[PDB]
Amino acid sequence: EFVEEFNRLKTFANFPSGSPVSASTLARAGFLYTGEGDTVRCFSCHAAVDRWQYGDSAVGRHRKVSPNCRFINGFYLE
Ligand SMILES: [Zn+2]
């Protein structure tokens, strides 16, 4: 259901314009938008990450936060 990138990106409906990190970048990293702030949450491991900054890596932060997530370890790559 959220295994496809595009379905995740449809959660970024009201995502703060001018977030240092874009909704695409975050959708690619496996993240859904919570609808609050710039707070997102990974669809597989359910970890949330907010407070995005210039030069952040969506993938990097996601791994840092949850290094054993099924998605970022490629277990969803079709
Ligand atoms: Zn995850």
Describe the structure.
This protein has 78 residues and is α+β, with helices and mostly antiparallel strands. It has one domain (1-78): Inhibitor Of Apoptosis Protein (2mihbC-IAP-1), Chain A (Orthogonal Bundle), CATH 1.10.1170. The chain is 24% helix and 10% strand. The chain is built from three helices and three strands, in the order ααβββα. It has helices at residues 5-9, 23-28, 58-65, and strands at residues 31-33, 40-42, 48-49. A hairpin with a 5-residue loop joins strand 2 (40-42) and strand 3. The longest helix has 8 residues, at 58-65. It is globular. It binds zinc ion (ZN). Residues 30, 42, 44-45, 47, 62, 66, 69, 71-72 line the site of zinc ion. It is found in: Cytoplasm; Nucleus. Belongs to the IAP family. It comes from Homo sapiens.
Put the structure in a nutshell.
This is E3 ubiquitin-protein ligase XIAP. It contains three helices and three strands; from the N terminus they run ααβββα.
